[PDB]
From Swiss-Prot, chain A:
Domains as described in the record: The MPN (JAB/Mov34) domain mediates interaction with TSSC4 and SNRNP200. Has structural similarity with deubiquitinating enzymes, but lacks the residues that would bind the catalytic metal ion. Contains a region with structural similarity to reverse transcriptase, presenting the classical thumb, fingers and palm architecture, but lacks enzyme activity, since the essential metal-binding residues are not conserved.
Subunit annotation: Part of the U5 snRNP complex. Component of the U4/U6-U5 tri-snRNP complex composed of the U4, U6 and U5 snRNAs and at least PRPF3, PRPF4, PRPF6, PRPF8, PRPF31, SNRNP200, TXNL4A, SNRNP40, DDX23, CD2BP2, PPIH, SNU13, EFTUD2, SART1 and USP39. Component of the U5.U4atac/U6atac snRNP complexes in U12-dependent spliceosomes. Within the minor spliceosome, which acts on U12-type introns, interacts with PPIL2 and RBM48. Core component of U2-type precatalytic, catalytic and postcatalytic spliceosomal complexes. Found in a mRNA splicing-dependent exon junction complex (EJC) with SRRM1.
Boundaries of the shown chain within the full protein: 335 to 390 of 2335
Organism whose genome encodes this protein: Homo sapiens (Human)
Associated disorder: Retinitis pigmentosa 13: A retinal dystrophy belonging to the group of pigmentary retinopathies. Retinitis pigmentosa is characterized by retinal pigment deposits visible on fundus examination and primary loss of rod photoreceptor cells followed by secondary loss of cone photoreceptors. Patients typically have night vision blindness and loss of midperipheral visual field. As their condition progresses, they lose their far peripheral visual field and eventually central vision as well.
Function: Plays a role in pre-mRNA splicing as core component of precatalytic, catalytic and postcatalytic spliceosomal complexes, both of the predominant U2-type spliceosome and the minor U12-type spliceosome. Functions as a scaffold that mediates the ordered assembly of spliceosomal proteins and snRNAs. Required for the assembly of the U4/U6-U5 tri-snRNP complex, a building block of the spliceosome. Functions as a scaffold that positions spliceosomal U2, U5 and U6 snRNAs at splice sites on pre-mRNA substrates, so that splicing can occur. Interacts with both the 5' and the 3' splice site.
Protein name, UniProt field: Pre-mRNA-processing-splicing factor 8
Source domain of life: Eukaryota
Swiss-Prot record, chain B:
Coiled coil spans: none
The species this protein was found in: Homo sapiens
Complexes and interactors: Component of the pre-catalytic spliceosome B and the catalytic spliceosome C complexes. Component of the minor spliceosome, which splices U12-type introns. Interacts with EIF4A3 and PRPF19 in an RNA-independent manner. Direct interaction with EIF4A3 is mediated by the MIF4G domain. Full interaction with EIF4A3 occurs only when EIF4A3 is not part of the EJC and prevents EIF4A3 binding to RNA.
Residues of the full protein shown: 149 to 406 of 908
Protein location: Nucleus; Nucleus speckle
Domain MIF4G positions: 15-198
Function: Required for pre-mRNA splicing as component of the spliceosome. As a component of the minor spliceosome, involved in the splicing of U12-type introns in pre-mRNAs. Promotes exon-junction complex (EJC) assembly. Hinders EIF4A3 from non-specifically binding RNA and escorts it to the splicing machinery to promote EJC assembly on mature mRNAs. Through its role in EJC assembly, required for nonsense-mediated mRNA decay.
Lineage: Eukaryota, Metazoa, Chordata, Craniata, Vertebrata
Family per record: Belongs to the CWC22 family.
Record-given protein name: Pre-mRNA-splicing factor CWC22 homolog
Protein backbone atom coordinates (compact mmCIF):
# COMPACT_ATOMS: atom_id res chain seq x y z
CA UNK A 1 0.00 0.00 0.00
CA UNK A 2 1.48 3.25 -1.20
CA UNK A 3 2.63 4.99 1.94
CA UNK A 4 1.65 8.62 2.22
CA UNK A 5 4.07 10.39 4.53
CA UNK A 6 4.24 14.15 4.18
CA UNK A 7 7.69 15.57 4.76
CA UNK A 8 7.46 18.95 6.46
CA UNK A 9 9.44 22.06 5.54
CA UNK A 10 10.00 23.84 8.86
CA UNK A 11 9.94 22.83 12.53
CA UNK A 12 7.61 25.78 13.19
CA UNK A 13 4.07 24.62 12.41
CA UNK A 14 2.48 22.01 14.69
CA UNK A 15 3.15 18.34 14.11
CA UNK A 16 -0.44 17.37 13.35
CA UNK A 17 -1.39 19.92 10.73
CA UNK A 18 -3.49 19.69 7.59
CA UNK A 19 -1.16 19.87 4.80
CA UNK A 20 -1.83 21.81 1.61
CA UNK A 21 -0.55 18.72 -0.14
CA UNK A 22 -3.47 16.61 1.10
CA UNK A 23 -6.62 17.00 -0.97
CA UNK A 24 -9.40 18.82 0.90
CA UNK A 25 -11.89 16.39 2.36
CA UNK A 26 -14.90 18.56 1.48
CA UNK A 27 -16.93 15.40 1.79
CA UNK A 28 -20.34 16.10 0.34
CA UNK A 29 -23.39 13.89 0.02
CA UNK A 30 -27.17 14.21 0.39
CA UNK A 31 -28.78 15.82 3.41
CA UNK A 32 -26.20 13.80 5.20
CA UNK A 33 -28.17 11.77 7.76
CA UNK A 34 -29.71 11.83 11.22
CA UNK A 35 -28.78 9.57 14.09
CA UNK A 36 -30.23 7.31 16.70
CA UNK A 37 -29.22 10.39 18.68
CA UNK A 38 -30.43 10.19 22.30
CA UNK A 39 -31.41 13.84 22.66
CA UNK A 40 -30.75 15.53 25.99
CA UNK A 41 -33.44 17.28 28.05
CA UNK A 42 -34.21 13.84 29.48
CA UNK A 43 -31.07 13.50 31.65
CA UNK A 44 -27.36 12.62 31.63
CA UNK A 45 -24.39 13.88 33.56
CA UNK A 46 -20.70 13.14 34.05
CA UNK A 47 -19.54 12.59 37.65
CA UNK A 48 -17.06 15.45 38.13
CA UNK A 49 -14.15 13.05 38.45
CA UNK A 50 -13.77 11.76 34.89
CA UNK A 51 -12.27 13.92 32.15
CA UNK A 52 -10.74 13.60 28.70
CA UNK A 53 -8.46 10.75 29.46
CA UNK A 54 -5.36 12.92 29.73
CA UNK A 55 -5.81 16.65 29.26
CA UNK A 56 -2.79 17.79 31.24
CA UNK B 1 -22.14 85.03 -11.00
CA UNK B 2 -19.15 84.43 -13.28
CA UNK B 3 -17.32 82.48 -10.58
CA UNK B 4 -20.50 80.57 -9.69
CA UNK B 5 -21.38 79.89 -13.34
CA UNK B 6 -17.78 78.75 -13.89
CA UNK B 7 -18.00 76.39 -10.90
CA UNK B 8 -21.31 74.99 -12.18
CA UNK B 9 -20.01 74.49 -15.72
CA UNK B 10 -16.89 72.86 -14.27
CA UNK B 11 -18.94 70.51 -12.09
CA UNK B 12 -21.20 69.54 -15.00
CA UNK B 13 -18.64 69.05 -17.78
CA UNK B 14 -15.97 67.53 -15.52
CA UNK B 15 -18.53 65.09 -14.11
CA UNK B 16 -19.64 64.09 -17.61
CA UNK B 17 -16.02 63.65 -18.71
CA UNK B 18 -15.10 61.64 -15.60
CA UNK B 19 -18.15 59.40 -16.03
CA UNK B 20 -17.25 58.86 -19.68
CA UNK B 21 -13.69 58.01 -18.66
CA UNK B 22 -14.79 55.65 -15.86
CA UNK B 23 -17.03 53.75 -18.27
CA UNK B 24 -14.26 54.09 -20.89
CA UNK B 25 -11.40 52.74 -18.76
CA UNK B 26 -10.03 49.60 -20.41
CA UNK B 27 -7.25 47.11 -19.71
CA UNK B 28 -5.12 48.27 -22.67
CA UNK B 29 -5.78 51.79 -21.42
CA UNK B 30 -5.74 51.36 -17.63
CA UNK B 31 -2.71 53.62 -17.27
CA UNK B 32 -3.94 55.89 -20.07
CA UNK B 33 -7.48 56.23 -18.72
CA UNK B 34 -6.01 56.68 -15.23
CA UNK B 35 -3.88 59.57 -16.49
CA UNK B 36 -6.98 60.98 -18.20
CA UNK B 37 -9.05 60.75 -15.00
CA UNK B 38 -6.09 62.49 -13.36
CA UNK B 39 -5.61 65.23 -15.98
CA UNK B 40 -8.96 66.48 -14.75
CA UNK B 41 -8.95 66.76 -10.97
CA UNK B 42 -10.43 63.46 -9.77
CA UNK B 43 -10.13 64.82 -6.22
CA UNK B 44 -12.30 67.93 -6.69
CA UNK B 45 -15.29 65.62 -7.08
CA UNK B 46 -13.81 62.71 -5.14
CA UNK B 47 -17.30 61.81 -3.95
CA UNK B 48 -18.64 61.65 -7.51
CA UNK B 49 -15.46 59.95 -8.78
CA UNK B 50 -15.71 57.18 -6.18
CA UNK B 51 -19.43 57.10 -7.05
CA UNK B 52 -18.60 56.41 -10.70
CA UNK B 53 -16.15 53.77 -9.44
CA UNK B 54 -18.84 52.11 -7.31
CA UNK B 55 -21.30 52.22 -10.21
CA UNK B 56 -18.70 50.54 -12.43
CA UNK B 57 -18.07 47.83 -9.84
CA UNK B 58 -21.80 47.25 -9.25
CA UNK B 59 -23.52 47.51 -12.64
CA UNK B 60 -20.89 45.28 -14.31
CA UNK B 61 -19.78 42.01 -12.68
CA UNK B 62 -17.27 41.72 -15.55
CA UNK B 63 -15.62 45.16 -15.25
CA UNK B 64 -15.11 45.10 -11.48
CA UNK B 65 -11.47 44.25 -12.23
CA UNK B 66 -11.02 47.43 -14.27
CA UNK B 67 -12.73 49.56 -11.63
CA UNK B 68 -10.46 47.77 -9.16
CA UNK B 69 -7.20 48.54 -10.97
CA UNK B 70 -8.44 52.12 -11.35
CA UNK B 71 -9.21 52.27 -7.62
CA UNK B 72 -5.72 50.94 -6.91
CA UNK B 73 -4.11 53.48 -9.27
CA UNK B 74 -6.07 56.30 -7.60
CA UNK B 75 -5.56 55.07 -4.01
CA UNK B 76 -1.85 54.21 -4.16
CA UNK B 77 -1.48 57.99 -4.51
CA UNK B 78 -4.71 59.32 -2.91
CA UNK B 79 -5.87 56.64 -0.46
CA UNK B 80 -8.80 58.83 0.62
CA UNK B 81 -10.70 58.30 -2.66
CA UNK B 82 -10.28 54.53 -2.76
CA UNK B 83 -11.06 54.62 0.96
CA UNK B 84 -14.40 56.30 0.26
CA UNK B 85 -14.95 53.67 -2.44
CA UNK B 86 -14.26 50.97 0.14
CA UNK B 87 -16.69 52.55 2.61
CA UNK B 88 -19.33 52.79 -0.14
CA UNK B 89 -18.83 49.16 -1.15
CA UNK B 90 -19.05 48.17 2.52
CA UNK B 91 -22.33 50.05 2.78
CA UNK B 92 -23.59 48.36 -0.39
CA UNK B 93 -22.54 44.90 0.79
CA UNK B 94 -24.15 45.32 4.21
CA UNK B 95 -27.26 46.65 2.45
CA UNK B 96 -27.52 43.75 0.01
CA UNK B 97 -26.89 41.25 2.80
CA UNK B 98 -29.05 42.76 5.55
CA UNK B 99 -31.92 43.47 3.13
CA UNK B 100 -31.74 40.12 1.28
CA UNK B 101 -30.73 41.78 -2.01
CA UNK B 102 -28.88 39.09 -3.95
CA UNK B 103 -27.67 41.26 -6.83
CA UNK B 104 -26.47 44.26 -4.81
CA UNK B 105 -24.77 42.10 -2.19
CA UNK B 106 -23.11 40.10 -4.97
CA UNK B 107 -21.88 43.21 -6.80
CA UNK B 108 -20.55 44.83 -3.63
CA UNK B 109 -18.81 41.59 -2.68
CA UNK B 110 -17.33 41.61 -6.19
CA UNK B 111 -15.91 45.09 -5.62
CA UNK B 112 -14.64 44.10 -2.17
CA UNK B 113 -12.98 40.91 -3.46
CA UNK B 114 -11.41 42.93 -6.28
CA UNK B 115 -10.15 45.31 -3.58
CA UNK B 116 -8.73 42.47 -1.45
CA UNK B 117 -6.94 41.15 -4.53
CA UNK B 118 -5.73 44.61 -5.61
CA UNK B 119 -4.34 44.86 -2.04
CA UNK B 120 -6.53 47.80 -1.01
CA UNK B 121 -8.81 45.96 1.45
CA UNK B 122 -7.45 44.17 4.50
CA UNK B 123 -7.70 40.49 5.40
CA UNK B 124 -9.65 41.05 8.64
CA UNK B 125 -12.49 42.73 6.76
CA UNK B 126 -12.66 39.90 4.22
CA UNK B 127 -12.60 37.49 7.16
CA UNK B 128 -15.53 39.37 8.69
CA UNK B 129 -17.41 39.22 5.38
CA UNK B 130 -16.87 35.49 4.88
CA UNK B 131 -17.78 34.85 8.52
CA UNK B 132 -20.98 36.90 8.34
CA UNK B 133 -21.91 35.08 5.13
CA UNK B 134 -21.09 31.69 6.68
CA UNK B 135 -22.56 32.52 10.10
CA UNK B 136 -25.89 30.92 9.12
CA UNK B 137 -25.09 29.59 5.63
CA UNK B 138 -28.09 29.08 3.39
CA UNK B 139 -28.02 28.65 -0.38
CA UNK B 140 -27.85 32.43 -0.79
CA UNK B 141 -25.25 33.45 1.80
CA UNK B 142 -23.02 30.41 1.25
CA UNK B 143 -23.18 31.08 -2.49
CA UNK B 144 -22.28 34.72 -1.81
CA UNK B 145 -19.23 33.57 0.13
CA UNK B 146 -18.52 31.17 -2.75
CA UNK B 147 -18.60 33.97 -5.32
CA UNK B 148 -16.39 36.15 -3.15
CA UNK B 149 -13.96 33.24 -2.75
CA UNK B 150 -13.86 32.29 -6.45
CA UNK B 151 -11.97 35.57 -6.91
CA UNK B 152 -10.40 36.42 -3.53
CA UNK B 153 -9.23 32.95 -2.51
CA UNK B 154 -5.69 33.76 -3.64
CA UNK B 155 -5.16 36.86 -1.48
CA UNK B 156 -6.56 35.28 1.69
CA UNK B 157 -4.76 31.95 1.26
CA UNK B 158 -1.38 33.45 0.30
CA UNK B 159 -1.28 36.30 2.83
CA UNK B 160 -2.81 34.38 5.74
CA UNK B 161 -3.41 30.65 5.12
CA UNK B 162 -5.25 30.70 8.45
CA UNK B 163 -8.13 32.19 6.48
CA UNK B 164 -8.03 29.28 4.02
CA UNK B 165 -8.01 26.71 6.82
CA UNK B 166 -10.87 28.42 8.66
CA UNK B 167 -12.89 28.73 5.44
CA UNK B 168 -12.46 25.07 4.54
CA UNK B 169 -13.21 23.76 8.03
CA UNK B 170 -16.27 25.97 8.53
CA UNK B 171 -17.56 25.04 5.07
CA UNK B 172 -17.11 21.34 5.82
CA UNK B 173 -18.95 21.62 9.11
CA UNK B 174 -21.88 23.83 8.04
CA UNK B 175 -22.32 21.94 4.75
CA UNK B 176 -21.85 18.40 6.10
CA UNK B 177 -23.66 18.70 9.45
CA UNK B 178 -26.72 20.82 8.56
CA UNK B 179 -29.74 20.22 6.33
CA UNK B 180 -28.09 21.46 3.14
CA UNK B 181 -29.13 20.41 -0.34
CA UNK B 182 -27.49 19.81 -3.72
CA UNK B 183 -27.34 23.61 -4.03
CA UNK B 184 -25.02 24.14 -1.07
CA UNK B 185 -23.48 20.73 -1.78
CA UNK B 186 -22.35 21.82 -5.26
CA UNK B 187 -21.35 25.26 -3.97
CA UNK B 188 -19.04 23.54 -1.49
CA UNK B 189 -17.84 21.30 -4.32
CA UNK B 190 -16.99 24.36 -6.43
CA UNK B 191 -15.22 25.80 -3.38
CA UNK B 192 -13.11 22.64 -3.00
CA UNK B 193 -12.41 22.64 -6.73
CA UNK B 194 -11.12 26.22 -6.65
CA UNK B 195 -9.06 25.49 -3.53
CA UNK B 196 -7.40 22.28 -4.72
CA UNK B 197 -6.79 23.76 -8.18
CA UNK B 198 -4.29 26.09 -6.49
CA UNK B 199 -6.27 29.17 -7.58
CA UNK B 200 -5.05 28.94 -11.19
CA UNK B 201 -8.46 29.64 -12.78
CA UNK B 202 -8.69 32.91 -10.82
CA UNK B 203 -5.45 34.58 -9.71
CA UNK B 204 -5.15 37.62 -7.46
CA UNK B 205 -4.97 40.07 -10.37
CA UNK B 206 -4.63 39.49 -14.11
CA UNK B 207 -2.08 41.44 -16.15
CA UNK B 208 -2.81 45.14 -15.75
CA UNK B 209 -4.79 45.00 -12.49
CA UNK B 210 -1.83 45.07 -10.06
CA UNK B 211 1.25 47.01 -11.19
CA UNK B 212 1.94 49.23 -8.16
CA UNK B 213 5.09 48.39 -6.21
CA UNK B 214 5.25 46.34 -3.00
CA UNK B 215 4.80 48.95 -0.27
CA UNK B 216 4.01 51.80 -2.69
CA UNK B 217 0.29 50.95 -2.39
CA UNK B 218 -2.23 51.65 0.39
CA UNK B 219 -4.17 48.93 2.25
CA UNK B 220 -6.56 50.70 4.63
CA UNK B 221 -8.85 48.66 6.90
CA UNK B 222 -12.42 49.96 7.31
CA UNK B 223 -14.68 47.21 8.68
CA UNK B 224 -18.13 45.91 7.80
CA UNK B 225 -19.69 46.12 11.27
CA UNK B 226 -17.64 49.23 11.98
CA UNK B 227 -19.83 52.33 11.72
CA UNK B 228 -18.54 53.52 8.34
CA UNK B 229 -20.15 56.30 6.29
CA UNK B 230 -20.70 56.71 2.54
CA UNK B 231 -19.82 60.42 2.28
CA UNK B 232 -21.25 60.27 -1.24
CA UNK B 233 -23.31 63.44 -0.77
CA UNK B 234 -20.33 65.15 -2.43
CA UNK B 235 -21.68 63.68 -5.66
CA UNK B 236 -23.85 66.80 -5.54
CA UNK B 237 -21.64 69.82 -6.12
CA UNK B 238 -20.91 72.63 -3.68
CA UNK B 239 -19.98 76.28 -4.01
CA UNK B 240 -16.33 77.05 -3.27
CA UNK B 241 -15.12 80.43 -1.97
CA UNK B 242 -11.51 79.23 -2.17
CA UNK B 243 -11.90 77.42 -5.51
CA UNK B 244 -8.85 79.36 -6.73
CA UNK B 245 -6.51 78.42 -3.86
CA UNK B 246 -7.69 74.81 -3.64
CA UNK B 247 -7.60 74.64 -7.45
CA UNK B 248 -3.95 75.70 -7.56
CA UNK B 249 -3.29 73.13 -4.83
CA UNK B 250 -4.98 70.30 -6.73
CA UNK B 251 -3.33 71.25 -10.03
CA UNK B 252 0.17 71.37 -8.51
CA UNK B 253 -0.55 68.07 -6.73
CA UNK B 254 -1.59 66.56 -10.07
CA UNK B 255 1.68 67.84 -11.54
CA UNK B 256 3.67 66.30 -8.67
CA UNK B 257 1.71 63.04 -9.06
CA UNK B 258 1.28 63.15 -12.88
Amino acid sequence: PNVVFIKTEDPDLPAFYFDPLINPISHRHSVKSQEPLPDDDEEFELPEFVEPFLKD
Amino acid sequence: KNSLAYQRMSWEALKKSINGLINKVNISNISIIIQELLQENIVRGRGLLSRSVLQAQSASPIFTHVYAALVAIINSKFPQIGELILKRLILNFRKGYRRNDKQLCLTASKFVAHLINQNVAHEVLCLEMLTLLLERPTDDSVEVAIGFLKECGLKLTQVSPRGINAIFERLRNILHESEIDKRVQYMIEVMFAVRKDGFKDHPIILEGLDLVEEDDQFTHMLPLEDDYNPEDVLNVFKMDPNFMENEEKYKAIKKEIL
